[PDB]
Amino acid sequence: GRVTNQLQYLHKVVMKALWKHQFAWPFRQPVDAVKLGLPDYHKIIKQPMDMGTIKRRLENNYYWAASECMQDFNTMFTNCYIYNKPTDDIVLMAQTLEKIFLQKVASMPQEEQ
């Protein structure tokens, strides 16, 4: 991978803000389908993603560009919306976090180093 201004911003500004959020706790580690008793989870969601995986990826220089990291954030939120019932609280929690994500992405340093 490599280090850019944008990947540093996604790590220190965007992820830090989302991580600490009161609705973040279900998203900080992989969904544990066994523990939650969701035997269909991995049959419906083919690309699991979580902020713990994204954080580790930013720290281990896995990403080559900001867009790749932003795609992982998007997969995490989309997985939640696709799997869960529209009425589930987790959907409202994902939407709240996703709004912060987009607000902070709009303020990201424009040209990548």
Place this chain on the structure above:
Amino acid sequence: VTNQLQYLHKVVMKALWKHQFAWPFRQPVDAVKLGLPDYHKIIKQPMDMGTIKRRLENNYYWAASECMQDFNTMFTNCYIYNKPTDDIVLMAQTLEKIFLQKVASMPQE
């Protein structure tokens, strides 16, 4: 007329509006036409590219983030309402990947 909103109009909406998977998203969901009587019960804030495009043309938005939330609502409505295996979900995912790719290069300020 911010730098960011011009980018969202000329780069993002330009790319998404003409995409081969855009046609289901170009106008509001017609629940009667599509036979979806539960659509307006499940989706409380309908959104579509027609509406976003109109809003960009009519200088409705005060910030880029507001236009970005409308795009996000349109995609999220699709993931929440539809079955995981429905083609429309793949089409939404494809458009949204382009949305995020282009937003990654949007100017600051």
